[PDB]
């Protein structure tokens, strides 16, 4: 833990130094450096560099102005290396990629990507890290959802290093499934010589199972580079303090941070705030109920957000742009989890699925129909398993949210309970 906190704090420190350096090169004010659109452009440059450029926004003469600068790719690479104490440091790079992936996840639905690959467009929750490149980092591999892995594999199905890349990806997906039966199917997908339709069909099946028997997907709170640099500049030593991507650290950092965004005339700044908050804590596919309780204000479904994407296209004019503070804080914090919830065990149940009438009174007599009726090789075993599962089944027993004053996470608050972010659109009301 101390050693993990050490190396994590080391990469965040590197990103920080880089960002400050990059902010001096462009002679940006501290406020301008803390504009999310400027941070993304800087982030994109160091990612693309591994000439390059993008739009950079300045507060000139009372109005927001856009400049499209350029840098030699060799120069950026040198700047990144030297901010990371000589080392090539690919970890900090993929950390900024996962941040970008989390924002993509929160902003865009990729139904067009899903349909081309023959997948159901209702597989959002499975699609964490879909915009993330194939053969990403180890952290990138961990952060990718089950569906992302299924999608990547079908693209493979549609030069014997192709074989190892196919088997590596099969194993990534396998390590994510929490039931042996799901894992055993992945073996049958992997053990195939010349994979094709049977494997394709198997992978579509596995993705569906992962909507109920959910896979183990990592979640890492990853913040815009401006947040880390800002902290480094202000006198915070991530190497001496350590740092965590799943503990209290990122919540505490945002609590001591102020990020800005360019805002269009039609846009609600609070709705922009929610979007970037969601992205920051990898919460695009979380239950809106828990996201809300944690944040302390309602986390509204995508379709009821009066906001477009963070990035301002070159198409639109800057004279109508204003700049707003992004509200990225929270009432509570909570540990980010690798788990997909309970899928295994099924040790008893303990509950009530019907009533026995005591009083002679006119009413309906409620009962849990799907559960009662439920009780009436590896493919059918999975069917039987997800037929047993209930939406009412509780996961993460005993685990709760925490006060921001609760550094060591000593006193869990268990919340007494609209769930789908991408559930509210012109085709479907979920």
Residue 275 CB burial class (10 angstroms; 0-12, 13-18, ≥19): buried
349 binds a second copy (CB under 8 A): yes
Residue 379 CB burial class (10 angstroms; 0-12, 13-18, ≥19): middle
Range 218-237, binding ligand 0MF (CB under 6 A): 231, 236
Residues 40 and 413: their CA atoms lie apart, in Å, by: 35
420 binds a second copy (CB under 8 A): yes
Nearer Cβ to a second copy, position 138 or 373?
373
Shortest distance in whole angstroms from residue 258 CB to a second copy? 24
* Closest CA relative to residue 244, chosen from 410, 135, 407, 101: 407
Residue from 64, 243, 333, 422 binding ligand 0MF (CB under 6 A): 243
Partner whose footprint covers residue 100, from a second copy, ligand 0MF, none (CB < 5 to 8 Å by kind): none
Partner whose footprint covers residue 39, from a second copy, ligand 0MF, none (CB < 5 to 8 Å by kind): none
Map tokens 């896979």 to a residue.
215
Interface segment toward a second copy; rule CB under 8 A; list 24-32, 72-80, 159-167, 379-387? 379-387
> Do 375 and 364 touch, CB atoms closer than 8 A?
no
> Using CB atoms, what's the residue nearest to ligand 0MF?
249
Interface segment toward a second copy; rule CB under 8 A; list 10-18, 48-56, 252-260, 409-417? 409-417
Residue from 19, 57, 238, 422 binding a second copy (CB under 8 A): 422
Residues 6+ apart with CB under 8 A from 117: 151, 154, 155
248 binds ligand 0MF (CB under 6 A): yes
Residue from 66, 252, 264, 329 binding ligand 0MF (CB under 6 A): 252
Task: Please provide the size of the chain in residues.
Answer: 430
Residue from 256, 306, 349, 411 binding ligand 0MF (CB under 6 A): 256
Nearer Cβ to a second copy, position 309 or 341?
341
SS3 for 261?
Answer: strand
Query: Long-range CB contacts (< 8 A, 24+ apart) of 267-270?
Result: 267/306, 267/307, 267/308, 268/305, 268/306, 268/307, 269/324, 269/325, 269/326, 269/327, 270/297, 270/327
Nearer Cβ to ligand 0MF, position 251 or 421?
251
Interface segment toward ligand 0MF; rule CB under 6 A; list 133-141, 182-190, 241-249, 411-419? 241-249
Q: How many residues bind a second copy (CB under 8 A)?
A: 94
Residues 6+ apart with CB under 8 A from 42: 19, 22, 23, 225, 226
Range 203-242, binding a second copy (CB under 8 A): 208, 211-212, 214, 217, 219
Shortest distance in whole angstroms from residue 127 CB to a second copy? 9
Strand intervals (E) in 195-314: 259-263
407 binds ligand 0MF (CB under 6 A): yes
Residues 245 and 251: their CA atoms lie apart, in Å, by: 10
395 binds ligand 0MF (CB under 6 A): no
Residue 389 CB burial class (10 angstroms; 0-12, 13-18, ≥19): middle
Residue from 36, 132, 253, 294 binding ligand 0MF (CB under 6 A): 253
What does the block give as tokens for 21?
């350096």
363 binds a second copy (CB under 8 A): yes
Partner whose footprint covers residue 387, from ligand 0MF, a second copy, none (CB < 5 to 8 Å by kind): a second copy
Residue 27 CB burial class (10 angstroms; 0-12, 13-18, ≥19): exposed
Shortest distance in whole angstroms from residue 45 CB to a second copy? 29
Residues 44 and 154: their CA atoms lie apart, in Å, by: 28
1 binds a second copy (CB under 8 A): no
Binding mask 298-337 for a second copy (x = CB under 8 A): ------x-----------------------------xxxx
Shortest distance in whole angstroms from residue 336 CB to ligand 0MF? 13
Backbone angles phi, psi at 413, to 5 degrees: -100, 115
Binding mask 87-126 for a second copy (x = CB under 8 A): ----------------------x-x--xx----xxx-xxx
Shortest distance in whole angstroms from residue 361 CB to ligand 0MF? 19
> Do 149 and 176 touch, CB atoms closer than 8 A?
yes
H-run or E-run covering 305: none
Give the footprint of ligand 0MF on this chain (CB under 6 A). Answer: 231, 236, 243, 248-249, 252-253, 256, 407
């Amino acid at each position: 833990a101390t050693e993990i906190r050490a190396s994590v704090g080391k990469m965040i420190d590197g990103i920080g130094r880089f960002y400050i350096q990059m902010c001096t090169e462009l002679k940006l004010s501290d406020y301008e450096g803390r504009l999310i659109q400027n941070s993304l452009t800087i982030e994109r440059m160091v990612l693309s560099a591994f000439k390059t450029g993008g739009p950079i926004y300045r507060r000139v003469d009372g109005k927001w102005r856009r400049e499209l600068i350029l840098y030699d790719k060799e120069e950026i690479r040198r700047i990144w290396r030297q901010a990371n104490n000589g080392d090539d440091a690919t970890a900090g790079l993929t950390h900024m990629m996962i941040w970008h992936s989390n924002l993509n996840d929160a902003t865009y639905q990729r139904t067009r990507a899903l349909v081309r690959t023959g997948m159901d467009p209702r597989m959002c929750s499975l699609m964490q890290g879909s915009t993330l490149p194939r053969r990403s980092g180890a952290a990138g591999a961990a952060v990718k959802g089950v569906g992302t892995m299924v999608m990547e594999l079908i693209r493979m199905i549609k030069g014997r290093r192709t074989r190892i890349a196919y088997e590596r990806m099969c194993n990534i997906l396998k390590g994510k499934f929490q039931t042996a039966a799901q894992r055993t199917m992945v073996d049958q997908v992997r053990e195939s010589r010349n994979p094709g339709n049977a494997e394709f069909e198997d992978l579509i099946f596995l993705a569906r199972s992962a909507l109920i028997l959910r896979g183990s997907v990592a979640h890492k709170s990853c913040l815009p580079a401006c947040v880390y640099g800002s902290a480094v500049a202000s006198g915070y030593d991530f190497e001496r303090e350590g740092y965590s991507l799943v503990g209290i650290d990122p919540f505490r950092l945002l609590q001591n941070s102020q990020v800005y965004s360019l805002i269009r005339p039609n846009e609600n700044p609070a709705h922009k705030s929610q979007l970037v908050w969601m992205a920051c804590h990898s919460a695009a596919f979380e239950d809106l109920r828990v996201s809300s309780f944690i944040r302390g204000t309602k986390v509204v479904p995508r379709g009821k957000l009066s906001t477009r994407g963070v990035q301002i296209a070159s198409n639109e004019n800057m004279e109508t742009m204003e700049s707003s503070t992004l509200e990225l804080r929270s009432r509570y914090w909570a540990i980010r989890t690798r788990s997909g919830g309970n899928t295994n065990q099924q040790r008893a149940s303990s509950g009530q699925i019907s009533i026995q009438p005591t009083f002679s009174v006119q009413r309906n007599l409620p009962f849990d129909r799907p559960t009662i009726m439920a009780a009436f090789d590896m493919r059918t075993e999975i069917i039987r398993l997800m037929e047993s599962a209930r939406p009412e089944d509780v996961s993460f027993q005993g685990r709760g949210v925490f006060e921001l004053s609760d550094e060591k996470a000593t006193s869990p608050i268990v919340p007494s309970f609209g769930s789908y972010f991408f559930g509210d659109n012109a085709e479907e009301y979920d």
